[PDB]
Structures are given as structure tokens and as C-alpha cells.
Amino acid sequence: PPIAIVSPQFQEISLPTTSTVIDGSQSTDDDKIVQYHWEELKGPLREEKISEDTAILKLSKLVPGNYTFSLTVVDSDGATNSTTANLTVNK
Amino acid sequence: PPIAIVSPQFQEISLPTTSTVIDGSQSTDDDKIVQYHWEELKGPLREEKISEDTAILKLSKLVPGNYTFSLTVVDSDGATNSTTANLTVNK
Amino acid sequence: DGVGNASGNWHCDSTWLGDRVITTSTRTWALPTYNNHLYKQISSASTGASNDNHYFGYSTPWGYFDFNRFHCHFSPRDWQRLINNNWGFRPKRLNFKLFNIQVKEVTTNDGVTTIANNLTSTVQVFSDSEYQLPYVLGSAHQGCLPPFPADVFMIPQYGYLTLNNGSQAVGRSSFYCLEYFPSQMLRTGNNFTFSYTFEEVPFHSSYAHSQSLDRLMNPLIDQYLYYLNRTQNQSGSAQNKDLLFSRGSPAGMSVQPKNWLPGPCYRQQRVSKTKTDNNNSNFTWTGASKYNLNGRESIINPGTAMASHKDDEDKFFPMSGVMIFGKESAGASNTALDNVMITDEEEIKATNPVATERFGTVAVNFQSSSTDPATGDVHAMGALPGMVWQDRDVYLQGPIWAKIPHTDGHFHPSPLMGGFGLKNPPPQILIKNTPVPANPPAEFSATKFASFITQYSTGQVSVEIEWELQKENSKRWNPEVQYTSNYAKSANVDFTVDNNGLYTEPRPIGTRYLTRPL
Amino acid sequence: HSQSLDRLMNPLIDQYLYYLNRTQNQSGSAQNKDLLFSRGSPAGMSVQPKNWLPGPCYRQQRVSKTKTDNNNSNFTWTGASKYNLNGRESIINPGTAMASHKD
Amino acid sequence: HSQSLDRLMNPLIDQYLYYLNRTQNQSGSAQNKDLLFSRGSPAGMSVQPKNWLPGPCYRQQRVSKTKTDNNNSNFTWTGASKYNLNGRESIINPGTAMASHKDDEDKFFPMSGVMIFGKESAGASNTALDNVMITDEEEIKATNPVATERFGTVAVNFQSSSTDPATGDVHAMGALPGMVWQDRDVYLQGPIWAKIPHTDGHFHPSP
Amino acid sequence: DGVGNASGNWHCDSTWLGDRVITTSTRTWALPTYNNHLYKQISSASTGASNDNHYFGYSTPWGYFDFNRFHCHFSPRDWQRLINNNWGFRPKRLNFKLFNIQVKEVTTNDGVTTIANNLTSTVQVFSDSEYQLPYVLGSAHQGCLPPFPADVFMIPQYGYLTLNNGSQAVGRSSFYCLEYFPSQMLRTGNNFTFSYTFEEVPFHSSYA
């Protein structure tokens, strides 16, 4: 289809240090993938979103809670696949 | 013993510009020193501590008041020496 | 001149002359039939690999000889005899021979393989001595001559990759038909010989500098050049900025005017061999050093020649900055720490930086009364004028040469895996069983052939490289550090066979044991 | 060149040099840091030990020929690559030999 | 050199190569992004396609000979340029061949980028400014950069409708292809030769 | 020069000149495959032998010729002809030849051995004429030429013992790889010849 895979689905970040990376760059295809698209499902506000239309995330300023992003890839010709990630952020 | 020496003991930082360096890298020994260890005695909170287990400090976001850090060095074999520094921060 | 006559003898000498050493090695090979004689293309669209792991290429039935590791020529005693008293070595000429060809043919009649000796079947061999082909050698693959001489090895399969727009094929993608080269038909009585002479490649520096680069001064006399010692006069109250210069130094050695610079740097990641002092992420590929080439990322691995760690930090290694040779009992997927051999690279700490460390700090702003002199942190550094460095060490396992790619420009063409960067490397010797078909039908058919006779070859192969040594000219007083065997009551002798005949190389042996002053 | 620089290897045989594949063992709960090395690669080509390096670089600005996907500033001379020589700035133009764009 | 490096063109004829002059058409209201190229230049010399590059750079610290315009810290060794070799730091001093200051900035000197010869009545410890001789290095301003100045600015991000074209500031620069530079001046006091250390590789072995 | 030609003739003379006697002997040999072509080490830790019976060594697939008994050269009449009227004897020179090599290959297909003649397979022979190897000969072992000339014999296996701290291996324990010597590939048509001249060893006093 366009098959996507996220880095783990499940991460464990220890407080106070909130600076992680979700690596959706191991997502495969039989051709090139035109773009990688990040979104967000859960989580509170006040985060510095950096480059949602790219491959490797640079996540900062994470409130301990439950974040849930989602990677979506687009083949040529267009085909989507949404695989999500969970951010179990604990003190 | 492990003899340590701090950059001055006494600094004078003018407001609003709060970005200083305490250079505990002139601390001597007869052998190598394994690590340099910074701590803190006085001062209010809300500072961005950067690399307390290193040689040259990078201090930022200093409230005008009285900070007091402390350098501690460790020889091989282990020997400690705590020499402190005062941060006379004035407007 | 067969059939009842050997077409060559077994030569496996290693002769040590004055300024040159001739290391002959002869192995027994076995060439199967690859692809059932087809130029099948290979791409990534069948498996469906990642965006940086797409490829496109072809996979021939030819097979190549790759004598491109050092233990294909040097026994561990000859390597020890070389690296202990030599400041350098380079090859002069090689001499390749391929004899005693036996073309068997196997019949799996009713589940029973009956291997039958065939006498009229041939074997095609050509050496690509004009470099029209992709040069797969020097990519550090398997399928070499084996280390231990009493091992029958199996010849690799010659595939090649070309340009791709992912798993597609751009109109620059070249196809190489390898029967469109003049090969040499070899029966069971003939032999393939050719000779080759290397370029005037520089000597591999098989020494370690006994002086640092920032310690190249007389420790007694002080200099005549001054510098700025102090930008703040201590008059016991506050700042003064009197700009105190003073001469030096006999003792303040870190601030003197040096004359040269350490080499280029490109930081890897500091990773502990002890698992408790590593981050709990993965890592690699998240915090690795990698480069964008045509919009696809690739780890540097092992990068530029840099030292592995600081003084007495043996637990740390650069994430991809070291050669990691596998032992036996090491699979090709997710092996633990014990079954590999991380080559510690620490003899080049003098000139070269540390791959897990910054290469200094430049300044950012302009210092004044208003703004403090903020400095930035350098991580990657291209070559400045006045930099000296020393190339990556070679190993008994590691590769001998590589091909300098035929580009319009290249800077210091030493291969990053170590070795001799050659413009015109030893040519690829490609070998292939001539396809002998099975019975054709009685009426003529247009379709090519769906049935051949299953066969394979075997035979011997001699490679004889003459090296040129650089005898040391030292006036060191105290003894050198040389590669010695562990003198102890041991369970098994190192670099030898086992209870059931498995040649196990226990450790990677470098070549930098001697000391030349810088 | 009909071959890439990071594609100078035999696509069939795998190397004899190892590297670090994994700094975190997946035991289905949390972090372990077991430092898993493994051989490669025939397929994981992006992580292998290469031998050479791509050339020098000095970034220019990515400007679209389509006017709708450019910033509404000016730009040039604001976000251009330029050098100080005797205290006066000059655009590099065209700079070092680099490719124009990706695939 | 009696010519600059970025002044190697005929001041009368304009070039035949174009470049991007403008990424925003002024139609007196707002942004348009029409990508206006135009030829040049006889006069807009800073934007032309040059052919060569100035030399490598590695920034020192801008320190005034006048004591009133220096920071009240110490400084040196806090904000100096230094390198890690086997885990011990050493000031570069005098570093690569770079010019000392800009046009008519004689009061400034790189913190460790100049030869500082001592006079007589100059001790070997904590001498003042008068008893030394800071060698001003300004004849190589043409090819070489200024040691207290950045060697240009690269770009960081990808410009689009969403994100502005942020540029980063270059401080240290290894040798690119096409760089020309000129080596450090000699003096009547300074040294004649040096030994190239017997290493396996060295880049442009001038001391 | 094979294949349809013998590469040597059967010489088994014993000629008695005045002051010298030339004793030729020719035997038929048979060399198997030892260790299945492996340099397996041998020690005492597997069996667990006594404190004076510990050893450590290696066991090659090579095989040696040991013509180091007197009846490999002298028939009992020639020995009687020697010892009855001679006050002494010593050897001057030897002359070793190795011919008519046949390399068979056996297929044990379904419990039935079908020995098939192979023609392209070789045989490696080298004479260690510089003494880099352990000299196992003279240790009074079996596997010589047989006494009686009409006997097919089987070639021994070349193993060697080195230094040990019991059944361990000290760092002086040498390992000898024997393909690291120039051998001679011999097909079914070639032959190995070399010659050797003894030292001026004293006469063996064959008198009482």
C-alpha cells in the first residue's frame, strides 16, 4: 500500500529530561516515498512543534502525560498509511 | 591532596546581561584528575544547569543575589578538594 | 597440460628478502552455477525495503576472486614479523595463477547425487584489465581467500548496482553483459595466468608517533613570541581590562603559539561497551552521523581517521568509527558484544583528534563592554591549511586496497576503511562455468533453453604479491612495544585450529607498534 | 558517474566489518542498553562502513521556480550565502560545485 | 596582493551569467514571489558569480588594545580558541594565516592570532602592553579572512511559504575546493624554518 | 607421463659392490584422508590421562613415509651377507622416488562402496628439507615400509607434540600449518623424486 513503521510505538521518557526523537524513517515502500507527514492525537498544549512534514522528529517540552502522534506516508502514486506512536512520559 | 583552584572566587556580573563562566580548569595535580564536579550552595531557583560534571561552566539566567557554587576534583587514586566561588551579581 | 598431468604446483611460500617480502598463497576453490546462467536484475521493489535502502542492479552468473584482505597473504607469524620491525610497507607487483581445473557435473538421480567427472567442459576466465566494469572489490565483502590455507572456499557471485530513482531505473543505468568481453575457455588441462604491477602508492605508515602534536617544543627554553595572558588586571576590587601580555612558555604549554594543527574531525557518538552507561533509546540511526547523497541518508561508518577514545577510556567507542570484525559463532544479524572484535584505534592520538570529542571551539560574537565573548562549539571540521593527520590503521583481517573512483576531483584519496587507494587497482578476475545444455527436442524451437546440465568447477588458485618494506632507522634507546603472544599455560593456542579444526583468529592485529618521532 | 558514491559495493555479498546496530535490547518492557552489534550489509546499505566521502558543501537557499512556494520577503541579500572580505560582504555565487536539487 | 579576491572583475563590462535579484515583486501592497532574475553586475558587485573563495578561517577573539573596551573577565582561557588533543586543551596560537582586523581597526587584535615579540625591559611573566610588539598582519586582507570575523553564513532550513529562510553563522571553516589563501608573514625576529612532522598525512605543510 | 603410461618401474634390487652395497626397495602404498582434512588439536584433557602422561599437540591430515627400519632395505639373506663379513657399515646417500599415483574415490551409495577411478585429482608431496617441522621419525613408530616386498602398506598420520603445562598450552607452543610449505601437486602422471646424501657418521661397529 505504502507501508509505514514507527520507531518504537512505545517510549519511556524520564523527567525532567524531555527531549526525544520518533524516527519514522524506517518506513518502507516499493518505490520512493514523496513525503512523511506527522500529526498528533492526544496530549496537552504548549509544545514547540518542529517540522511535522519531515522524517525524523525533534520533540521538546513534553508534559508528563500521554502524547500520541501519527505518521502518514505518501507514495507516488498517492497511497496513505497511518501508524501511530505512544509517548508514555513518566517522572 | 588533589589541589583545586577556581577562576576567581569573586565575580561581578552587571544586569541585564547574565551569562558568565567559572573556569575551574586551572586546578592542578601531580597526576591526571579524573573528573571535575560542580555543586551549588546558595542562590534562588530557576536556572538552566548545564554540565555540572565538567570543567568549564556555562552559566545562564542569573537572578541578582548571591550564588555560591563549589568545585570538587578527584585524583586517581581518589582524593577530594572543595574550593568554592561567589557570584556577586549586581545591577 | 592435462589430463594426466598437473597444470601447476602448490606454492604457499613467504620469503623475506632485505627490502621486500614475497607472500605466495594458494587455495582450493569451488565455483557453482549462479542464477542457472541468467542475468537476472535485482532491485528493491520485490522485497519493498526502506527509502534509504532502495537499490537497482543486476546479478550475473559470473564469479570473482577477491584476495583483498591481508590474511590472504600473511600468516600471523609473518604479520608479526612485519609489524614489529618495519616503519612501512607497500606492494610492488602481484602474480595471479589459476590451475588444476576440474569440472565435475552432478546428477541428482532419484534423490541420490552422483557427482561425475566431466572432461570436455570448459571454464571461462577473464581479468577485466581495462576497468569497463563496476569494481565491487574494496567494498569489504566475504568470499575472499580463506585465512587458513587448508580451507576450500566458494567463489562469490558478481552482481553490480547502478543508478536508481528509488527502485526505478534512470536512463543512465548501465547494463553490463559480461560475455561481451573476451574470456578464456579453460578445459581440465589449461591454466589462467596474468601479472600486475601496482602504482607508486605511499607506504602505509606502520608506526605510532612517540610525540604529541601539541608537545613539539623544547620543555626547557621559553619562546620569544608573546600572547595575551590576561584581559583583567586583579587590583582586588573589580574589572580593569589592562591587556597584560607575557612571554611563554616553558610550563604554560597550552597557550603557546603552535605551528601545526590536528587533523579533520567529524564527531561520532560516544557509546560505552558497558550497557549500564548508555541511553535507553535506539540509537543507532537516531543520533548517528550520516550524509545526504541524492536525497538518501547513509551512515559514515567508519568516517575519517580519528582516535577511538581519550586516555584510559577503553570502555568507549565511536558508534560508527571503528572496524568491527566478527568472530566465529557470530551471525549476520543482531550479534552480542562478545562475538565481535571492535578494533581499538589509539595509536594516532598524537596527530588525529578523538572521534567522540569536539575539535575545539571557535568564537561567535564580538566581545565588547556590552556583550560577553560567547564561543561556539566546533563538531565537524574540513581541512584547514596546516593540518596534519595520520590515516586509519590496517589489520590482518581488513582490506588491502580500494579503487579511487574516477571523478574529476578527490581530496587525499586514502580509503576510509584503511588501505592503499589505487587509481588502477588489481583487475577483477571473473570466472564462470560454460553452460552445457541438456538434450534439445527433435523439432526446432525458438525459445532459448529451460534445461542445462547442473555442474560446478573446482581447482586451485595462486596469488603472489611482492611487497616493498620500509626498514626502520630508529635511535630510540628503550625497548619498543611489539606484538607478542600471551606466554601462559593456555587452553588453546591463538591463531590456530581447534579440537575439530576451526581456524579462529582471536583478536584484530593492527600494524602501529613502532615509534618514529613526530 | 553511472554509480553513486554511497553505492560502491557488491549488492550480493555482505561485508566482514561490523558496526553498532542497536543500543537498546527490546525485551518488551523498557530500556536495556545491551549494545548489539551485527554484521552487514547486503540490504541495510545506509549503515555500512563506506570508504570515501562526498565533497565539500556550503548551503545556498532553496528557491522554487514556482512563485507560490516562496517566502514573501526580499530575500535575496537577507538569506543569502555571503562572505566577509576586508569588511565588505559579497554573495558566493555560484559557490562550490554542488548539485542543484534532489531526485 | 594589489587586488582583492572579490574584486577580480572588469569594473565596466557586466557579466553574462544571471542570478536571483528578487524573490518578492513590489506591487505596492504585499508579497508576490515572482522570482525576478536579472543580469549583472557592473555595480552590484557583491552578488555576482565569483570564481574563487577566500581561505580557511577559525575565529579568534576580538580584543582591543584600549583597555576600556574589553570585557572585565579573564578571558583569556575562558573565551579562547583551543583544541583537544589526547584529552588536554591547548590554545591554537597563532592559528591559521588570517588578517588581523578590518579596514581602519588598528586597535583590535586576535587574542591568539598574532606574533607578539617582546622588547627589552619585558619580563617572562605578566608584562604590560608597551613592552611587547604585536605584529599587525593586514597585507593579506585580500585573499585571507579576518581572524575576528565570521567566514560567511550558510543556510539552515528549507524556505517555504510556512517557514522563513533562517541562516546560520559560520565560524570555523575547513578547506573547500576552490579556496585560495596566503600564508603567514615572516619577520626579522621570527623563525626561519620548522620540521614537518613525519606523519602519514599533512595538509599544506606551512608552519 | 600418464595417463596411459607408467611413470616409473619397479626396482627392488640389492647389489653388492666391493666397498658399497646399494639396496633398492619399492613398496605399494595407500594414503587415506585423515581428520577429514582438519588440523584438529590433540591433548590429554579429553581422555584425562595420568600426570606423567599429559600431552598437547596437533594432528594434521598429512601423512609421512618412514623408511627408518633396517628390513625396509635388507632382505634376511642380504643382512646375513652383511653381518658375517663386515666390521662396519654406514650409509652414503639415499634416493627417494614416488611414482604411479592413482587417486581413487569411493562412493558408499546405499551401503555399497563403488570405488571409482578419478583422473583430475592431485596429491601433494613435499620433503621438509630445511627441518622447520617436528621430526617425528626416529621415535620408533609403526607405518614403515613393510618387511616383505609384496605387501601393501598404509601411510601414517603426521601429528606432533609441543610444550605443555600439563594439558594446557604455554605461549611457546608452536603451531605448524603444513600447507604453508611449498608442496608439489601430483596428478596420475607425475612423480616425486629427490636425492639426499648422509653426513660422515661413524661406521656402526658390527663386531664383538
Numbering used by the authors:
A (entry chain R), B (entry chain R): 407 to 497
C (entry chain A): 219 to 736
D (entry chain A): 427 to 529
E (entry chain A): 427 to 633
F (entry chain A): 219 to 426
Reproduce passages from the article:
Adeno-associated viruses (AAVs) belong to the Dependoparvovirus genus within the Parvoviridae family. Because of the broad differences in their tissue tropism and transduction efficiency and the absence of pathology, AAVs are the promising vehicles for therapeutic gene delivery. Adeno-associated virus receptor (AAVR), which is a glycosylated protein containing five polycystic kidney disease (PKD) repeat domains in its extracellular portion, was recently identified as a key proteinaceous receptor for multiple AAV serotypes to employ the post-attachment events of viral entry. To dissect the divergent rules of engagements between multiple AAV serotypes with AAVR, we select two AAV serotypes, AAV1 and AAV5, and solve the atomic structures of their complexes with AAVR by cryo-EM.
